[PDB]
Symmetry: D3
Subunit: 221 residues, 6 copies
């Protein structure tokens, strides 16, 4: 495809989607066997390997709705991928969400215009695939992780002049801020494939755990 | 409160929210014991009774975001309600959603402006309380119902000049159309209380209904 | 129709539209003769009777644009209704509007998205039928009521976090807040039929009279 | 004021507002006595004279919301004007509206952003002063004119790539298109003064004009 | 055309566009020879004359996007005009822009809805014709003027309740406020013709020079 | 900074901003001397070296408004960068724009919400720094390149369901589509620093690239 140089058939139907291509490399090296690197276009590393007997891929997405949209569109439309699990980080809005918590996004709010353009006059709520969500939730519960299932903000702007609306979203139970989920969920829905975002809380607005999170994402995917 | 004539303490912390006040009456009569009617203001019947030893209420909401918003605000702010489960109907958008399926809304899209006003420049995605959602899903699964968990459209307009965008939403996996969930989920989130919508597919764009009420009561 | 169980021909061409179905019952019982109840679907009572020799109906609408839109669409499209007069309550924004004043809405502002969806990029101003408006105004004047003709806000939200914009609308002469008029006026205009809203001021944001208001609405309709 | 060179007190409390400054000249010459021209800034002629014993002014506004907004703001805030009646032309959308009909705008739709900026998230419906509207309607009726009271479109764009939405507005009873009323009505409402627009249908998408000026003067 | 009474062929392919029709008269009288007045419809004076051997026209536009849009549409579509240079005034937002500075607008921000209607969901940035811009910039530089090339605000509202957003735009380098440029640039782009706005700073939000500015606009056009 | 591991002073005041970090590497290797790599966080390579006696940096931005916004904010606010020149690719909308043409963006349209959030109710037109634009234009002209100065679309979506609006923008003279300029120009304006985007037409909806880098370095 335009941004992925990997053949037909080189990418597995199940794929993990870290924002950071170097985390894709870390995931492939740490968890996968029989690994090949299928992409280095724009340094956006993608790998395919085997995890407990199943082929799985792991592909960097870059940061932000537009970047992940490129890779997700190409993965689905050009490579026939069917299960896509973002594995990322996020920033907690509120005090009850703690660093190293694992957040599974049921849905995502956004300041992106991507869905207003597609559905003028409507608020589109991007939804996780429930089957994948349940699978990841159960795996995370079994793993002994602090797993929170809920709402996140998919932000276009990492640096905001005022965090007032972010705080307000926190008051309406939005757990954390990140920069990809709206796109992943919307595009997965568009193409009738299955998506989920599993996030580690790395900071506040106001690794051993990461490995466990990758494990539950691998298990789900 | 303005639209509910109940005395303090007469409404249970767990409440079912049918759109139709006559369905509230049906639910109270069919499933509850030790029933009292606590509201007849605007004919919007509300009841409290006991289900398997727990006090539970059931309150009509009327149709549409503005109507349910009134009742949900009053229930939360004036009556200290904590768990709110809409029990409603919806119209399937897609072929794979069948009449009498039970839909549990994870989230809701909307053509309402309610959230654009509150969060200018943002798309707010109203989210179900996951704990309640899981509880209802597990109950419905155990019950042997066809339960679908997914996205719904909360519509302001029942009669649309064109259903092009509704069809498009169906193409993006939106399961069905109804007229309340956005408001219920948003206001519950605002006040830090727990909400869920459990819906019977009644049309396309009863025995089933009883089983759905049962799982809503159980989750509630 | 979907929400009205009344036959063909059971609903009169002129109809009053209280938000409260129990007010429909009150109106039918108090003012009409030869009354039949043609609807109890969802408890949304509708009646037809005779007032000074003319058949007239009275139908609850419920609260809010979406609720009244349902009934108005069905009344016009399924029952051939031609003159629709909402008879409601409203909350005064400003000090110069007094409790028990009768407001006749020339037009309505709104926070609803209903018209932005229909006319993207435009502000649609829903307008009363002038003939009905004049008729009601003259009847109210003759009756000795305090009648104010002007602008109202049709609100989606009864409970607002901040009343700042409502106050601002009051500063621009918007008289009162209610929750139906935009829909009634827009749909009446769509179908080329005649609508009006006559409102009693019941509260501030910051019965003998009701009967007189029903009388002028009956006279107009 | 910035765009009007009149001294304090030179402008009457009642004023007619044609879009065309040459029509202001025509109105002053044709109908008024004891006339003075109080403004020629930007050629936007303004006059004050006497009509049946009352001082009245007549001021060109130019075309479009931004142009009329300038003059109306200055007239209200700098000159203490209280009654403002636009006397203009418009283009009929619908077949049932005929050339030379007089339209009295009860309200106006618009494609302008002026009110979305002031009231974010709201549709503001600019409303005529009912007292003035009734006065003009009664005068026009008495005059034997075809007078239509209803909705108009205040357009930012005279030349539109597609008139689909204009046609749609006509389907919702919008009578005619013009380019000022939204601004006049909104600003009059802002400042608690009285405004009306009385329009002659000149096209579809004089003797009549004189009679319309007469009813505007009478209402004014 | 509807608003211009001048024949076919009476208007030159190059035209200056002052907002004030009396400035059109001043420009024609002061700079042009062999002058004819081709329009007095609505007092919106338009002239054609000769400047250094070339026919050029000068046409008032009135104030505001809607007014200039009328004249620009008619000039392009009915009279085949190809080079359009607005010559106007503007109000400086910020302290570093001085009275009597000449501003050449590269682009314009706006509170107008004109472009949101044309390109729903998009921000359209109206752009000057670079060739004309360069020509005017070089002429202004040669003339010894203080010429600033940059961004302006095309306002619908001259009188704003709050100047907060205008100040904010000034903080983002927007130089001055005026009321025509968005329309001129957008319509010129629509029809594939060449436009520029050259503005004299006449005021702050918070003639010898004018003649020199007209001279550079004449030279460019 | 959060996404750049450079020590204070390691990044030059003048910087080139390719979307592709591997192009940053190519630029540093091909054109610069005394090169150090100051960043590998997220593989988003950044280098500083010397070009004709001046320190200059080159930093990958990634694709899309949100990605470039992160880097540009950090470069300006944490590293005191003053002159920022995006060196990118774009897709021609129109027939008259040819592959390998160099486009210098005077401004950018966008489907991003970034500026609607900052300036509600306004269309913000992000503008290049004219001084830099002129410098690059003159360099490109001198170089014998086909240089077009004009409007571009900064897109959030590379893959669009319909390219109708993109075609329409091309009809209004928008030259090409790319995915960063709106952000770069807006943030540079916010912080009072100087930005420009110089783009190679790579597709429709190298030797050329080297010459373009050269003019960007010269302007920088
Ligand atoms: N506080 C935060 N705000 C926005 N994105 C964040 C935050 N913390 C982590 N992220 C994630 O990391 C990247 C931005 O640093 C994005 O891909 C985003 O998903
Ligand atoms: N097809 C449908 N469209 C909209 N609402 C529906 C539909 N079917 C059932 N409903 C539900 O029933 C009521 C409208 O008839 C609303 O309360 C709504 O939730
Ligand atoms: N203050 C108020 N705000 C909104 N709606 C009101 C108010 N007072 C009366 N109403 C009317 O009564 C109902 C809400 O109580 C709606 O149908 C509405 O029209
Ligand atoms: N068809 C029309 N479209 C828009 N404005 C019109 C029309 N006919 C007359 N007008 C009025 O005349 C001027 C535009 O020619 C404006 O002041 C406007 O109010
Ligand atoms: N401060 C200002 N605000 C808006 N427009 C201005 C200003 N100064 C001059 N103008 C220009 O002059 C007219 C408004 O007085 C408009 O045509 C506009 O372009
Ligand atoms: N046709 C195109 N559409 C969008 N972006 C493009 C195109 N061609 C090149 N680009 C640029 O390349 C990247 C997307 O491939 C973005 O960084 C963008 O600026």
């Amino acid at each position: 495809s335009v941004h992925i140089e990997a053949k037909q058939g080189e990418i597995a139907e199940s794929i993990l989607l870290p924002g950071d291509p170097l985390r894709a490399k870390y995931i492939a090296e740490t968890f996968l066997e029989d690994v090949t690197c299928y992409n280095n276009v724009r340094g956006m590393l993608g790998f395919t390997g085997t995890y407990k007997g199943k082929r799985v891929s792991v592909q960097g997405t870059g940061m932000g709705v537009p970047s992940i949209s490129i890779y997700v569109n190409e993965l689905i439309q050009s490579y026939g991928v069917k299960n896509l699990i973002r594995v990322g980080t996020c920033g907690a809005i509120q005090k009850d969400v703690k660093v190293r918590d694992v957040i599974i996004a049921m849905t995502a709010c956004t300041d992106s215009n991507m869905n207003r353009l597609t559905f003028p006059g409507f608020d589109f709520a991007p939804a996780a695939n429930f089957d994948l969500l349940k699978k990841a939730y159960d795996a995370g519960t079994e793993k002994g992780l602090h797993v929170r299932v809920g709402n996140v903000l998919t932000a276009d702007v990492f640096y905001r002049e005022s965090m007032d609306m972010v705080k307000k979203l926190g008051d309406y139970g939005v757990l954390a801020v990140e920069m990809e989920t709206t796109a992943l969920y919307t595009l997965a829905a568009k193409y009738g494939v299955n998506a989920l975002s599993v996030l580690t809380v790395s900071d506040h607005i106001f690794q051993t755990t990461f490995n466990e999170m990758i494990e539950i994402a691998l298990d789900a995917a």
